[PDB]
Amino acid sequence: SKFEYVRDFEADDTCLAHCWVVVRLDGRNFHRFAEKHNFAKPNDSRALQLMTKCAQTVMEELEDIVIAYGQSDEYSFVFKRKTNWFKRRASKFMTHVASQFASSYVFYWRDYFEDQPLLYPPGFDGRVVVYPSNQTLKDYLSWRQADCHINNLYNTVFWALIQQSGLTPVQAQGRLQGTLAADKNEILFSEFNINYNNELPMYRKGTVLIWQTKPVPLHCDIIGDAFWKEHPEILDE
Amino acid sequence: SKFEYVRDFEADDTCLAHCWVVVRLDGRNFHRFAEKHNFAKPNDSRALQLMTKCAQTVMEELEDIVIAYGQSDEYSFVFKRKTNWFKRRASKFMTHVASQFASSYVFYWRDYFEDQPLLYPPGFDGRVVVYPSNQTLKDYLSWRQADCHINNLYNTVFWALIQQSGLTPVQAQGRLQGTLAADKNEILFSEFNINYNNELPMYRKGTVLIWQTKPVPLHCDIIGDAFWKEHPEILDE
Amino acid sequence: SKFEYVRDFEADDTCLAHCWVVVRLDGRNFHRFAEKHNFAKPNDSRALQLMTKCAQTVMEELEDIVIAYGQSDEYSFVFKRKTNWFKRRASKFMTHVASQFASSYVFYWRDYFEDQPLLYPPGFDGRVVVYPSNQTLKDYLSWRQADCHINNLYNTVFWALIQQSGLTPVQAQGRLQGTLAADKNEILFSEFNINYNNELPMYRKGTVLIWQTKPVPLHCDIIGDAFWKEHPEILDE
Amino acid sequence: SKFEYVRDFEADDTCLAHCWVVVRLDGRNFHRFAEKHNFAKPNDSRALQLMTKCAQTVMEELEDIVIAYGQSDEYSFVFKRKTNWFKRRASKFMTHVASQFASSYVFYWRDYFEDQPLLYPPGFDGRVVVYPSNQTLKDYLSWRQADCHINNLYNTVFWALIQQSGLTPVQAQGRLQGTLAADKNEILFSEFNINYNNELPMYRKGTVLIWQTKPVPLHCDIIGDAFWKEHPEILDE
Ligand SMILES: Nc1nc2c(ncn2[C@H]2C[C@H](O)[C@@H](COP(=O)(O)OP(=O)(O)OP(=O)(O)O)O2)c(=O)[nH]1
Ligand SMILES: Nc1nc2c(ncn2[C@H]2C[C@H](O)[C@@H](COP(=O)(O)OP(=O)(O)OP(=O)(O)O)O2)c(=O)[nH]1
Ligand SMILES: Nc1nc2c(ncn2[C@H]2C[C@H](O)[C@@H](COP(=O)(O)OP(=O)(O)OP(=O)(O)O)O2)c(=O)[nH]1
Ligand SMILES: Nc1nc2c(ncn2[C@H]2C[C@H](O)[C@@H](COP(=O)(O)OP(=O)(O)OP(=O)(O)O)O2)c(=O)[nH]1
Ligand SMILES: [Mg+2]
Ligand SMILES: [Mg+2]
Ligand SMILES: [Mg+2]
Ligand SMILES: [Mg+2]
Ligand SMILES: [Mg+2]
Ligand SMILES: [Mg+2]
Ligand SMILES: [Mg+2]
Ligand SMILES: [Mg+2]
Ligand SMILES: [Mg+2]
Ligand SMILES: [Mg+2]
Ligand SMILES: [Mg+2]
Ligand SMILES: [Mg+2]
């Protein structure tokens, strides 16, 4: 050797046994990316589906992933809790998911933005997070979907006031400050004749991914017991 | 909130202060990748330069990277020890580097393999490693370059016995087993008239990357004090 | 400051939320300790009760400890899973438990070994371990009690062959090698007229500690659902 | 097994190679302890020497400790950077030091407080901290000694105003608020005829411990190059 001792400094990063491991990817500086690639506000069917695409690439190229959830510039992958893939080394789980996803992005870019030219190669960030119980995991997801629902309902009526109402951003925010759920939902139905509840289920619920085999996308609620009692092969395994 | 508590389970991963942080990327299952994309043995000018390309993308899109080194299906990025980028969160450092690199790969694929068609989107793995001293860091690099030199000298004469000598792999390995440095180096000069020491400096030394501004590639030795006394802006900062 | 920056190098050690934290203490070089303080084989009522003593000291001086279990030169303390004591910093949990226990040992030494003189100050080691589920925690305990039962049944018949049978250690081990449960249990009943099942419940079951208030010691089985259905205030909290 | 799988949940805690490991002990609730055991303000020769005692116990019973430093209710042990004791497992280093120290405390209590009766068994806390360079380590110590010097100079004149000047605490603090170094140092020399610089070197410099063999206590400055150039066997090893 004479130099291989340096390998000793590599610290362990094993994830806690019998726990759900979760890798959450989120595009870097994507606010600036959507700009330069003219993304549709508040939702851009192309983007969401490209992301859902990459997501599947990942769910197929990697392993033990029993579910994924996407929304905005992000995706979460939930590996089977008894996974033994890579000895549960957190560093592996996050870097493979992250790299795979990022190379799949530029790859399938044309399939979704046939007209639009990818200006530069995009960045993504990762992280691993361990959830000890099905409840905590479930809660994690709900935290995400719910985050989605709170952002879409905000952006939908936020951009309708800028575009279809001709208001500068600084205004639309000043006008929506303090509004409740029914508050915004009304500003839509009555101020733009938009019935939120009719919006695409991929904008107000995000995207789910399950095996059916292959990773079939869905836009159903995952916060309610129903979805889970309907799909028990996912958690009790 | 009502669900945001789940965020609390995200464990710290801060890297030890005043230490060199190092991210080392290495292509996944690349043995099978080089196969399907017909890579040249023992070296493939295209591959090495694409890698060196991505590497620069990374050194520009990210920050505080004072040096990089590449070889085979890998690259190491050494961030400035007093870096404060991302509060030294190991998870960030590795996933950005990994994702960026992977998206840049498919992006600039044509520029290097204009003829060859990228068959699928490639995978990369990451990791962070902290080195407490300039000596240990330097040793790390030497470990890499030296690893490079030991593999190239082995593969060069390993493939010359299979290709230009018509030997099955199982043979060439049985014939090289136990050979010393001068042993292989001779099997070349006298059995194929190949003077190893004349081989491309990018095959037997790998690739280095420094600022000159922009990331200029080099193929000089980094194991010898010379290189460092010649470039002190890199370590003593 | 001018020197306080060094405080920054103190790494986080927070234990995973909603998880059972467990500190397990085990006397250092106690084999040599029991020797010099003439401990009774295979059990020494003094030792076990001193340990159970210290254990209570700990359960009172520290907090959120919902249960403890002792045996041989060790004790395990199980903190309430939603504990927030010390922000769940693993380093605190283990060092307080360890120090407290060690000072209580020398303190109450006379109360248990009134005749015997403590020769030197004894050492103890600690560690923290996180268990994600009640099942895993329960399993942990069973692992301990069961370890206890497997050692006591071995030592009881191991020392009866050395003392009451006049056999050198090397022999008694050669004679017990390969024996089953009923094998040793018989070597007792028929070779020394000792009915194992009649042995003190503190030798073959160890010691448990629960609040009743104060930490009341017990010597009942904790591997069987009974104990738990009998004491639900412990886990479901 | 059938239960031993639970052992798998024990996470690694290895300290970074080629780095100074440091265990810092600090008495728990000692403010209340000194009270009940009538400690002398601002310094109590008994306490400081008992602590320095325990400290030596530790430096002898454990290993690779190349130096220690004490002051107030605390002590720091600095293990030799290339130590391999316990595979550098942080959990071991801190719990042994902590337990050993705590049992030695109650043990040698009489030798220092022959008159005073130890009321209850005392608590201590631990932690491990890794320093990458001799400079950072040195700085750590200076941080401690300097902390000592800043507290002793504050307490000395803080208690002289309460005792020898008959002022309630709330006052003495209101009077010392905003004073500089020369400010307090003068309030002494001129208001109580006390020349600080003449105070015991164990009160304004703390305590150091080196091998000479055995752990010989000292009260010299360790912040100045002198001490180190005078003792090079400690760091360059
Ligand atoms: N117009 C448009 N922009 C979108 C859409 N989905 C995501 N984005 C963009 C704008 C959002 O600021 C961004 C996602 O939020 P982030 O918090 O990740 O912001 P950003 O990516 O700048 O931050 P980060 O990369 O995490 O540092 O992606 C979409 O459907 N349409
Ligand atoms: N023909 C050819 N293959 C190359 C060249 N550079 C790298 N490779 C391939 C073959 C090597 O097995 C591989 C790099 O070694 P690795 O140990 O990373 O193997 P592999 O990527 O299969 O493992 P891993 O992905 O780490 O699990 O990349 C090249 O210039 N020419
Ligand atoms: N005679 C006697 N010895 C006992 C009794 N309880 C414990 N011991 C002693 C002998 C055992 O070897 C030791 C506990 O087992 P350990 O595996 O902890 O051994 P030891 O303490 O030497 O190792 P360690 O300190 O963990 O490095 O304590 C007892 O009741 N009677
Ligand atoms: N009278 C007196 N008290 C002392 C002496 N040395 C230490 N102490 C006591 C009073 C100080 O508040 C205490 C050491 O400071 P700490 O910050 O450790 O306070 P305390 O032990 O309450 O906090 P902790 O246990 O860390 O939670 O020990 C001494 O020589 N004389
Ligand atoms: Mg983010
Ligand atoms: Mg983002
Ligand atoms: Mg986002
Ligand atoms: Mg590898
Ligand atoms: Mg590879
Ligand atoms: Mg490789
Ligand atoms: Mg042990
Ligand atoms: Mg032991
Ligand atoms: Mg034991
Ligand atoms: Mg403290
Ligand atoms: Mg204290
Ligand atoms: Mg203190």
- How many CA atoms are closer than 13 Å to the CA of A12, on its beta-carbon side? 12
3-state secondary structure at position A23: strand
Does residue C126 contact residue D91 with C-beta atoms inside 8 Å?
yes
Does residue B165 contact residue A22 with C-beta atoms inside 8 Å?
no
Q: Left (φ > 0), alpha (ψ -120 to 50) or beta: where does B121 sit?
A: beta
3-state secondary structure at position C111: helix
CA distance D186 to C154: 73
Does residue D95 contact residue D102 with C-beta atoms inside 8 Å?
no
Nearest to D126 by CA among C105, C94, C101, C129: C94
CA distance B18 to B6: 32
Q: How far is CA D84 from the centre of its chain?
A: 24
Give Dmax over CA atoms of chain B in angstroms: 75
**Which residues are CB-contacts of A94 (< 8 A; sequence separation ≥ 6)?**
A23, A126, A127, A128, B91, B94, B95, B126
Tokens of C109: 């030494």
Of residues C8, C9, C17, nearest to B8 (C-beta): C17
CA distance A61 to B102: 14
Yes or no: is domain B1-237 CATH 3.30.2040.10?
no
Q: Return the residue matching tokens 């004791």.
A: D85
CA distance D81 to D64: 9
Does residue C24 contact residue C126 with C-beta atoms inside 8 Å?
yes
Tokens of B138: 């330097």
CA distance A148 to A157: 14
3-state DSSP helix/strand/coil % of chain C, to nearest 5: 45, 15, 35
Does residue A218 contact residue A227 with C-beta atoms inside 8 Å?
no
Determination approach: X-ray
Q: What are phi and psi of B179, to 5 degrees?
A: -75, 150
3-state DSSP helix/strand/coil % of chain A, to nearest 5: 45, 15, 40
Residue nearest atom 3 in ligand 2 by C-alpha distance: B34
Nearest to C11 by CA among C84, C91, C83: C91
Return the residue of A nearest to D14 by Cα: A11
The answer to whether the CB atoms of C118 and D107 lie below 8 A apart is yes
Cis previous bond, D169, omega within 30: no
Kindly list the residues from chain A whose CB atom is less than 8 angstroms away from the CB atom of residue B76. Answer: none
Q: Return the residue matching tokens 């044309």.
A: A110
Of residues B16, B133, B136, nearest to D130 (C-beta): B16
Residue B26 is labelled as binding a ligand: yes
Kindly list the residues from chain D whose CB atom is less than 8 angstroms away from the CB atom of residue B18. Answer: 132-133, 136
Q: Return the residue matching tokens 């903190």.
A: C79
Does residue B140 contact residue B128 with C-beta atoms inside 8 Å?
no
CA distance C221 to A103: 56
**What is the rounded radius of gyration, in angstroms, for the C-alpha atoms of chain D?**
20
Q: Return the residue matching tokens 């500003």.
A: A187
Does residue C65 contact residue C209 with C-beta atoms inside 8 Å?
no
Return the residue of D nearest to B15 by Cα: D16
The answer to whether the CB atoms of A17 and D11 lie below 8 A apart is no
**Resolution limit, Å:** 3.0
Tokens of D46: 């008994």
Tokens of B178: 């136990």
Q: Which atom of ligand 2 is nearest to the CA of B35?
A: 1
CA distance D209 to D200: 17
Which ligand is the nearest neighbour of the Cα of D72? 4
C152: how many CB neighbours lie within 10 A of its CB? Answer: 23
Does residue C152 contact residue D33 with C-beta atoms inside 8 Å?
no
Residue A29 is labelled as binding a ligand: yes
Does residue B121 contact residue A54 with C-beta atoms inside 8 Å?
no
Q: How far is CA A77 from the centre of its chain?
A: 9
Does residue C69 contact residue C75 with C-beta atoms inside 8 Å?
yes
Q: For D14, which DSSP code?
A: B
Ordered by start, the domain boundaries in chain A are 1-237
Tokens of D70: 């004490």
C129 CA: distance to closest CA in chain A (Å): 10
C178: how many CB neighbours lie within 10 A of its CB? Answer: 7
